[PDB]
Design a protein around this nucleic acid. Structure first.
Ligand code: MG
Ligand code: MG
Ligand code: MG
Ligand code: MG
Ligand code: MG
Ligand code: MG
Ligand code: MG
Ligand code: MG
Ligand code: MG
Ligand code: MG
Ligand code: ZN
Lengths: 216, 174, 144, 37
RNA sequence: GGGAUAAGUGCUGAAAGCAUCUAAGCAUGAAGCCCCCCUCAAGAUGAGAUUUCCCAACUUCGGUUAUAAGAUCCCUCAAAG
RNA sequence: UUGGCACCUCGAUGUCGGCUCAUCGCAUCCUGGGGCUGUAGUCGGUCCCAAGGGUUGGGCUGUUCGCCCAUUAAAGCGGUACGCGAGCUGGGUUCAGAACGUCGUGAGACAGUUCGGUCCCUAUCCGUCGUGGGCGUAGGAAAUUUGAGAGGAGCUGUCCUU
């Protein structure tokens, strides 16, 4: 079981051995370091905490997340590492295989590895029931005054209320999503890029977490 | 309980040891240990054992008969053992032994393998007869049932795994 | 003339007790603990204040049932979602979460009031024979 | 199996028994197998 | 895939010398049940855990104070709205 | 279901069908597990367990039904004010016009027919879907988290081989 953190760059295509067009997503997974190792003894569970992407060192009057705060700088320093923008825990990996301050390389994954990619999906803002919940529209003509409305939200005196889980307009997207059983097409060590077959959630520049597929 | 009243005669070779409710019986073939009913009281003689029920209540009467039988079975099992024989019927139905484990071919695309259990012996004769031998009557019975369950006998032609002395009802298909 | 004593926080003294659940029927243990928690065993018992004592229950895993309750006594909980009814048997609850089984049993015998909720918070239940409240210096209590 | 309120022996061989609190009939003839319900 | 089950199917077994899947005991058995998979989740007021950062003077000795780490106002913005 | 009764509502509890959105029961249509069979096999019949998921598009008619075309693993049956008109429609029905048959001396009338015919409302409270602020969580903070709970998902065909 392996895990790495990367940023989504975009999509492209690669030609397979038989000349099949393979839709791919380019992920850059440079600057991964094991910040901390969590153990059952101390934390009650085993995990490695990986910090990805170096951030600038602490300064006195930092006004942004670009510069590490004193708490963050200390945590990273314990691992003898530079402060990191993104930090995530991998429970799947074996703690013994890793040492604190160790670099996690893209070469950990190899071509043909089946992986699960986790990321936050693209935000869509306030969205109606048709787009958010894939509901059918009402008639567009024939006297209709019902087009993009959600429909009846209940029954009558029996229940005299709307049940929890009724599908209504609200904020859509910006949700954690895991796409399972994706494949590593290629690993570029020089550019620190992993090529994942298919597409993964979130905008370009978004954080992606790549893990060995849970289902095998 | 006439069964409960009947005494169990210990074979001279076999030795029965009672620790509280639990009883450990040692014989030439093997040693068997079980826990008998707490209420039942056991009187032991060199050549025989008697089980005694405290009350004539149904619960005591029921347990008395069972307790006697369980002790009797253990004693007989260690002395002589119990064996159940199963006979495969139908063309292409064969039994073979892979080490301790038994391999059964019974008109299936996949071969069926039954793993051997502790205190049980699987033996095959002619590839059409399988015998299960063990100290425990229950253990032999269970494994025999499992072997028989792999392919139960069909009514029309009698094809399947059956107990050697089992009777199968026969029907005419057409 | 009005002469009835009224207990108040200034004069109330709460003790700590340990009760062993081993070999005890759930309900019979439960009803006794409920009275101790509510101060019913004190002469200074006052309704509008908590005069009760803290109770530690140990060996909750070893609590007993009669008849076929282990399989036939079912706890039902609703999530407030349509079709959101969830059930686990008393026996399974004893295996998985014995502390909850005891806790819910006693709390169901306590009043559903602000005071009643407070009195239930004084109950500490443990599945094993060991508890972490040695500092409270609890006293063993034998159920009547 | 016959599931019926009236469970009774159909033939001489039929035997009335109780399993798990249910009146049942067992017999060599499979047709006469019964369970009260 | 796992655990426990339904209707079932048994093994051993008496009450009831026989018999009997059941009473004691022991197995097996469904898209179902509890998990396994995904998501939210400590206002879980029972408010949990780990790592790191900050740590002084006054004072009526009761406590206060602005400051620390940190975070905002305001401003340039978008992957967010 | 057709009724019986006339108990809440006549200072108003909108009524058929469809559309939108569902939700629940199981007496189960399909799929899963079984028993018996007048079960050779392939198929079936009947009964038991089982509500997890699934359960199509058309022609005619206002239709619900129902018949039919073509499918499907299957085209389940019921409750929810015959679910849902402050969510939609308004074809039927249930105003004023007109006409046919019929009845009436007539004015008119007909669970007979025919054509035409105004569907209002800026959401206070609960409920629901989203999204912030306060305080708490015995110092003040930055990150990473455990999971008590809760939600989601859960369906199937055909073909090849044996
Ligand atoms: Mg449409
Ligand atoms: Mg319009
Ligand atoms: Mg009859
Ligand atoms: Mg009257
Ligand atoms: Mg009114
Ligand atoms: Mg049923
Ligand atoms: Mg209606
Ligand atoms: Mg309405
Ligand atoms: Mg109209
Ligand atoms: Mg009329
Ligand atoms: Zn018969």
């Amino acid at each position: 079981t392996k895990g790495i953190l990367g940023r989504k760059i975009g999509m492209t295509q690669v030609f397979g051995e038989n000349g099949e067009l393979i839709p791919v997503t380019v992920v850059e997974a440079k600057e991964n370091v094991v910040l901390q190792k969590k153990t059952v003894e101390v934390d009650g569970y085993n995990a490695i905490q990986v910090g990805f992407e170096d951030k600038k060192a602490y300064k006195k009057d930092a006004k942004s997340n670009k510069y590490a705060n004193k708490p963050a700088e200390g945590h990273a320093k314990k691992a003898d590492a530079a402060p990191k923008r993104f930090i995530r825990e991998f429970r799947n990996v074996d703690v013994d295989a890793y040492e604190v301050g160790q670099e996690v390389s893209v070469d950990t994954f190899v071509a043909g590895d089946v992986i699960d990619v986790t990321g936050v999906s693209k935000g869509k803002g306030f969205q109606g029931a048709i787009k958010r919940h894939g509901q059918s529209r009402g008639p567009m003509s024939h006297g209709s005054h019902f087009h993009r409305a959600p429909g009846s939200v209940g029954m009558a005196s029996d229940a005299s209320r709307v049940f929890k889980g009724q599908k209504m307009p609200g904020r859509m997207g910006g949700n954690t999503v895991t796409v399972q059983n994706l494949e590593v097409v290629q690993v570029d060590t020089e550019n620190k890029v992993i090529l994942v077959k298919g597409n993964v959630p979130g905008p370009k520049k978004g954080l992606v977490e790549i893990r060995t597929s849970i289902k095998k | 309980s006439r069964v409960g009243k009947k005494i169990i005669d210990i074979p001279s070779d076999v030795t029965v040891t009672f620790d509280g409710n639990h009883v450990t019986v040692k014989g030439p073939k093997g040693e068997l240990s079980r826990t008998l009913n707490e209420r039942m009281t056991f009187k032991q003689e060199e050549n025989t054992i008697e089980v005694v029920r405290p009350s004539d209540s149904k619960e005591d009467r029921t347990n008395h008969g069972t307790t006697r039988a369980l002790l009797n079975n253990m004693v007989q099992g260690v002395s002589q053992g119990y064996v159940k024989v199963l006979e495969l019927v139908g063309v292409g139905y064969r039994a073979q032994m892979q080490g301790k484990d038994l391999i059964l071919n019974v008109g299936y695309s996949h071969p069926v393998e039954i793993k051997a259990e502790e205190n049980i012996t699987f033996s095959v004769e002619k590839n059409t007869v399988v015998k299960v031998e063990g100290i425990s009557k229950e253990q032999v019975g269970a494994l025999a049932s499992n072997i028989r369950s792999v392919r139960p006998p069909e009514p029309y032609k009698g094809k399947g795994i059956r107990y050697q002395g089992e009777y199968v009802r026969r029907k005419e298909g057409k | 003339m009005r002469q009835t004593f009224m207990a108040n926080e200034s004069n109330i003294e709460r003790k700590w007790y340990v009760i062993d659940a081993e070999g005890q029927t759930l309900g019979r243990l439960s009803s006794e603990v409920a009275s101790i928690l509510r101060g019913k065993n004190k002469v200074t018992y006052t309704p509008h204040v908590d005069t009760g004592d803290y109770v530690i229950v140990i060996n909750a895993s070893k609590i007993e049932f009669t008849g076929n309750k282990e399989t036939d006594k079912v706890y039902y909980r609703h999530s407030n979602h349509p079709g959101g009814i969830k059930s686990i048997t008393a026996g399974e609850l004893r295996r998985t979460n014995p502390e909850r089984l005891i806790e819910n049993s006693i709390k169901g015998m306590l009043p559903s009031t602000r005071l009643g909720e407070k009195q239930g918070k004084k109950l500490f239940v443990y599945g094993g024979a060991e508890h972490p409240h040695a500092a409270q210096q609890p006293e063993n209590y034998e159920l009547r | 199996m016959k599931v019926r309120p009236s469970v009774k022996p159909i033939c001489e061989k039929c035997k009335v028994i109780k399993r798990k609190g249910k009146v049942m009939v067992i017999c060599e003839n499979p047709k006469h197998k019964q369970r009260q319900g």
